[PDB]
Design an enzyme around this catalytic site. Structure first.
Site, PDB file in Angstrom:
ATOM      1  N   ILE A  26       0.844  -1.186   0.000  1.00 53.06           N
ATOM      2  CA  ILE A  26       0.000   0.000   0.000  1.00 53.06           C
ATOM      3  C   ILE A  26       0.884   1.243   0.000  1.00 53.06           C
ATOM      4  CG2 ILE A  26      -0.284  -0.481   2.473  1.00 53.06           C
ATOM      5  CD1 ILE A  26      -2.505   1.893   0.376  1.00 53.06           C
ATOM      6  N   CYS A  27       0.829   1.998  -1.082  1.00 50.81           N
ATOM      7  CA  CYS A  27       1.633   3.200  -1.208  1.00 50.81           C
ATOM      8  C   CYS A  27       0.756   4.443  -1.195  1.00 50.81           C
ATOM      9  CB  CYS A  27       2.458   3.145  -2.493  1.00 50.81           C
ATOM     10  SG  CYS A  27       2.324   1.579  -3.391  1.00 50.81           S
ATOM     11  N   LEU A  28       1.117   5.399  -0.355  1.00 55.36           N
ATOM     12  CA  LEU A  28       0.369   6.641  -0.248  1.00 55.36           C
ATOM     13  C   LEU A  28       0.919   7.669  -1.225  1.00 55.36           C
ATOM     14  CD1 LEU A  28      -1.951   6.455   1.576  1.00 55.36           C
ATOM     15  CD2 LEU A  28      -0.070   5.168   2.601  1.00 55.36           C
ATOM     16  N   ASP A  29       0.020   8.389  -1.879  1.00 55.69           N
ATOM     17  CA  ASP A  29       0.394   9.406  -2.858  1.00 55.69           C
ATOM     18  C   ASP A  29       1.283  10.482  -2.242  1.00 55.69           C
ATOM     19  OD1 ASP A  29      -0.383  10.390  -5.757  1.00 55.69           O
ATOM     20  OD2 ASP A  29      -0.534  12.166  -4.481  1.00 55.69           O
TER      21      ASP A  29
END
Ligand SMILES: [Zn+2]
Ligand SMILES: [Zn+2]
Lengths: 147, 52
Positions: A84-87
């Site tokens: 899960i990568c956050l912008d």
């Protein structure tokens, strides 16, 4: 000194947690946050109990935390392996940012995901092609994984 | 008072210690760290600190 932030925010988001994102227990390590998130009412995501193990480095309030979802949830921007990568966490970030903002970013990503694929494009491709195709499995998966 | 940089208390004379005029005040035992592993940027601006 600076480590207090981990426990302080842990208890902070434990008693009075923000929208959807809730904290409390820790993982196998103090820098391994075992937070729980709840799905929205607009998207096919329920509350249940989805754990997200966030790994903080020795520079937690300076370096982007490595978020790794523990509970496999069917989300176009959350890979089955926990990717899960956050912008706002992409390409560095502003030194010290409260975990609340980081967690809230996931909440905003819960309400109608992003077509931009991460590690595995499959979940993003299905969403980009047809909403119902992912809608039917999203609500089903979130239910089957709701223990 | 506790600096959101480490969620730790501050000093009396540290309340007027802000490496940025964006109202973001932080204890010396926090700003120095930003200038150790980070580029010494504002935690809410990404801009470099005017401080030494
Ligand atoms: Zn401090
Ligand atoms: Zn600033």
């Amino acid at each position: 000194m600076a480590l207090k932030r981990i426990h302080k925010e842990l208890n902070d988001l434990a008693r009075d947690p923000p929208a959807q994102c809730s904290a409390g227990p820790v993982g196998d390590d103090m820098f391994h946050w075992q937070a729980t998130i709840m799905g929205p009412n607009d998207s096919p995501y329920q509350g249940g109990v989805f754990f997200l193990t966030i790994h903080f480095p020795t520079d937690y309030p300076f370096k982007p935390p490595k978020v790794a979802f523990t509970t496999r949830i069917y989300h176009p921007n959350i890979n089955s392996n926990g990717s899960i990568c956050l912008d706002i966490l992409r390409s560095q970030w502003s030194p010290a940012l409260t975990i609340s903002k980081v967690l809230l970013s996931i909440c905003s990503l819960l309400c109608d995901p992003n077509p931009d694929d991460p590690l595995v494009p499959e979940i993003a491709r299905i969403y980009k092609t047809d909403r119902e195709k992912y809608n039917r499995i999203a609500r089903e998966w979130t239910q089957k994984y709701a223990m | 008072v506790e600096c959101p940089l480490c969620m730790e208390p501050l000093e009396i004379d540290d309340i007027n210690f802000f490496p940025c005029t964006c109202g973001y005040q932080i204890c010396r035992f926090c700003w120095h760290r930003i200038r150790t592993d980070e580029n010494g940027l504002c935690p809410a601006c990404r801009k470099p600190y005017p401080e030494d």
